[PDB]
Design a protein around this ligand. Sequence first.
Ligand SMILES: O=N[O-]
Ligand SMILES: O=N[O-]
Ligand SMILES: O=N[O-]
Ligand SMILES: [Cu+2]
Ligand SMILES: [Cu+2]
Ligand SMILES: [Cu+2]
Ligand SMILES: [Cu+2]
Ligand SMILES: [Cu+2]
Ligand SMILES: [Cu+2]
Ligand SMILES: [Zn+2]
Ligand SMILES: [Zn+2]
Ligand SMILES: [Zn+2]
Ligand SMILES: [Zn+2]
Ligand SMILES: [Zn+2]
Ligand SMILES: [Zn+2]
Ligand SMILES: [Zn+2]
Ligand SMILES: [Zn+2]
Ligand SMILES: [Zn+2]
Ligand SMILES: [Zn+2]
Ligand SMILES: [Zn+2]
Ligand SMILES: [Zn+2]
Ligand SMILES: [Zn+2]
Ligand SMILES: [Zn+2]
Ligand SMILES: [Zn+2]
Ligand SMILES: [Zn+2]
Ligand SMILES: [Zn+2]
Ligand SMILES: [Zn+2]
Lengths: 335, 335, 335
Amino acid sequence: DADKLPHTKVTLVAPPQVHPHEQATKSGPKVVEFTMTIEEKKMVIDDKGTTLQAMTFNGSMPGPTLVVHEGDYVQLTLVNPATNAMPHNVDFHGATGALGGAKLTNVNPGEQATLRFKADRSGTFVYHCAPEGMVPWHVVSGMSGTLMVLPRDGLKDPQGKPLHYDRAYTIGEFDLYIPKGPDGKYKDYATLAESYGDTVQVMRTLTPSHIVFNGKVGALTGANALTAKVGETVLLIHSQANRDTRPHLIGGHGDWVWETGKFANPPQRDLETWFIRGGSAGAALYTFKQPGVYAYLNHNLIEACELGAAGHIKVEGKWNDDLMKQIKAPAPIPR
Amino acid sequence: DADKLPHTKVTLVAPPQVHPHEQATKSGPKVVEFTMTIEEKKMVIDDKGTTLQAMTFNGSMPGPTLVVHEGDYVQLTLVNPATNAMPHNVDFHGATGALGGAKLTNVNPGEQATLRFKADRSGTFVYHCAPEGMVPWHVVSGMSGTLMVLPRDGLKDPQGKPLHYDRAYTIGEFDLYIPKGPDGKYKDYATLAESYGDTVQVMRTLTPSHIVFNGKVGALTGANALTAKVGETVLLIHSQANRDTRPHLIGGHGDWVWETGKFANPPQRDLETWFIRGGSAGAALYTFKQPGVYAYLNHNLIEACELGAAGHIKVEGKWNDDLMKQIKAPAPIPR
Amino acid sequence: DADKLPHTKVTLVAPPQVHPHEQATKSGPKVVEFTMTIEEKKMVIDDKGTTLQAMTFNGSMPGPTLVVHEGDYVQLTLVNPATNAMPHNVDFHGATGALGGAKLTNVNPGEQATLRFKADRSGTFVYHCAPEGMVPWHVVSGMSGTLMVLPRDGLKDPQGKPLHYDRAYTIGEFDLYIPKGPDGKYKDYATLAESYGDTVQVMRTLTPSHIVFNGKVGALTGANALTAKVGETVLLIHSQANRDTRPHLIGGHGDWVWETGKFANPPQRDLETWFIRGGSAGAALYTFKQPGVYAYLNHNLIEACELGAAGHIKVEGKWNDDLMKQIKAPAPIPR
Ligand SMILES: O=N[O-]
Ligand SMILES: O=N[O-]
Ligand SMILES: O=N[O-]
Ligand SMILES: [Cu+2]
Ligand SMILES: [Cu+2]
Ligand SMILES: [Cu+2]
Ligand SMILES: [Cu+2]
Ligand SMILES: [Cu+2]
Ligand SMILES: [Cu+2]
Ligand SMILES: [Zn+2]
Ligand SMILES: [Zn+2]
Ligand SMILES: [Zn+2]
Ligand SMILES: [Zn+2]
Ligand SMILES: [Zn+2]
Ligand SMILES: [Zn+2]
Ligand SMILES: [Zn+2]
Ligand SMILES: [Zn+2]
Ligand SMILES: [Zn+2]
Ligand SMILES: [Zn+2]
Ligand SMILES: [Zn+2]
Ligand SMILES: [Zn+2]
Ligand SMILES: [Zn+2]
Ligand SMILES: [Zn+2]
Ligand SMILES: [Zn+2]
Ligand SMILES: [Zn+2]
Ligand SMILES: [Zn+2]
Ligand SMILES: [Zn+2]
């Protein structure tokens, strides 16, 4: 019985961080309490000033990542402030019943609700808004994130051997559908509701205008690059709630990857590129062996390099000449 | 030798049902006899009256599902009535040789042919029409279905433990390419042959106008929803003969999934969303734990919700508060 | 230490062949030396005379396949002749560090460089050009190929049993983005640099104009069909450096397939259709059981049959009536 159990309250953090948590744990099941507040807002999504009439959990794209253990109960208070215009709810793919919790969390502006469900299945799972009759629009406008349910005894390799990460990052990839006017410039809308009709028309073409990590072209670059150091193992959580993507770490690999994102299945090793089905979250472990600036991108290189689906990881440490060595630098072709 | 074996005749049923059959079986190999009759016809595919000049096996999209066991021989009589206009044939992906049987089953209107092949490989396999020089058109116009070849000892989990379904449903997902006229309205054609040229032009854009389960937007909804009850295990066969899709059961999971559809491989568990490669059939088992109306859809939510790739499953039984509970219903945000 | 090891020089061959090599080997690690020379050139890519301002490794699309064993070191001399116009480099997905070697191999026309890296991970891996700020264009214009790193003890099935191929073929699949002028005809450009701007615009639509194996519609057909005979096992290496594809052998199967392409993972068996993520190379084994002309294609049948992603394999040997038999040839429907 769930009412029997100890409760615990978690404080969420903004992507690309993930809130402090234990992997393998000696603790027994808890009721883990979270709160998220919906925020609609206009966001600038590229370096040319294009804006999106966006919708978010907790003010970020993606929403924050929620972490529990298998056998825990997730208890979410979802708040829809009166400063928003639309009704919202939440569908946890990690949950069983009631359209993922959507039927039990319909919240008009000025309302809130509390849902509990048992996290009985391990993996990274998408959660997203799913209001009746306007599902894709809320999703593509930014309302998704990841619930990670860790096995109580931590991650395992195909032979049952223990795996771990030293640091976790969460990347949400968003296919955006920004309309254009007769002058071929992207439209800027005064309200969310005004964007709707034109946006549906772009959606129906199936061609995103932009595809971005974490809300903006260049979100995970420069000062906001991810960081690591040689010897450290990183977990890269990648969610795409609406469209397929193909993550790749340039100069690296997926050492162990659950591309379907479900930790009771054996991971695959040595991946160059993996696949996140639209409507899922996946997870890759990599232990850094070389220092330098890596790119982490969607390996449809048009989607990455023209449309925005690419970030950076800056990795400290000592170069390893056994792994790779410039034998002869660029120099004239001798004749 | 195949001429040695007992024959048996199977009566096919219309999707989304699958004809009566045994899973694990003590019977030895049989020659399993089927017949299908091709039917070209105009079909209404959406709620706005749009029509498709369609082509079908047995009058339905998809064609009916054929079920045998590994080691059986499939023996198909394919009939192309003189009331049709085009030549047809059939390519079984479950078969070895002769372009899947296409080279041996070329049938002009008024002809028929009988093919036999050995079902030596277990899984769900696409079959489709493949007339020389007009393959994609026949496929996208509706000519595909699934052959399911069960292992003689039934389905197995990754550890070799037995799995079963209590009920099987078959869903064919069809990317349709319906042309539009200068007024932006979909074209209605008096004959199949008249649709061809304009349809090729839409196909070459790679953008479907509609994407539908089982022939029509809303095919598997309302009175035609799929049904189950709590405690029952269902097999959801999903075929897509031309384009990738990503099945998802909202409020449920794929308990055991063979997304590539081949039962000698271990299934994956706990999937939120799986992937059916264009040109394949996949299969998922789920045991219902909560009652209610579920959506089964392609989790590109534009393809599902705007373009049509979505159906419903109405599930009887008792709600389970341990799995999920509304702790606090939607209600004003206290201040 | 790598400087300790014996060196060996490999002579490359043009696709669809793969250079002579050993699978399981008693030899210890070597430094394997290769050379490739970049060639920019206009190529005719279809039967209607359309041209592409192409970029290639070694004059072919794809580049040639390089084969080593796990634990070897690849040592590549990359040469960019002064007759080319653009700078180039190379990113080996099989390598660790420095953006796959791209940062250490930047070569302007008239220069060359030599890179070494350790092939410490088994599988087929894409390599491609990745010049800063123009990555997708170089890739989609033809600059990719496969590095195959075999396990030292050869390929293995899921139970550790030995697998082999008798013959290997390499297929690169290229999504091309050829611009059109106001008359709706494809543009022919006098130089590579002149194609750039218009090509970017087509790329951003995400809709290829052509999708081809090995550089041209029909590249692997007629006199250039692949060949096999009944009883022979073939390895079909399939690379796609930019876009997803779904290989299928019509009338055959993937007997053992590593669709993610990484040989330390167990292969899947009996596949009808497999999936190569954009940015990866995959590998399938098939042992031929029937003679005849097979099609090997991308099973989005529009991409294959309208856009070009399809070739042929002509297989010698004796027909097998147990596997498949025409019981009754096409003939009038009796009444
Ligand atoms: O690995 N280059 O995208
Ligand atoms: O799980 N919602 O599509
Ligand atoms: O298997 N026919 O494409
Ligand atoms: Cu919402
Ligand atoms: Cu969902
Ligand atoms: Cu047909
Ligand atoms: Cu086929
Ligand atoms: Cu280049
Ligand atoms: Cu790459
Ligand atoms: Zn309690
Ligand atoms: Zn916990
Ligand atoms: Zn809508
Ligand atoms: Zn560590
Ligand atoms: Zn880029
Ligand atoms: Zn960058
Ligand atoms: Zn007989
Ligand atoms: Zn049987
Ligand atoms: Zn055609
Ligand atoms: Zn049962
Ligand atoms: Zn929907
Ligand atoms: Zn519905
Ligand atoms: Zn040396
Ligand atoms: Zn070697
Ligand atoms: Zn560019
Ligand atoms: Zn052999
Ligand atoms: Zn074709
Ligand atoms: Zn052909």
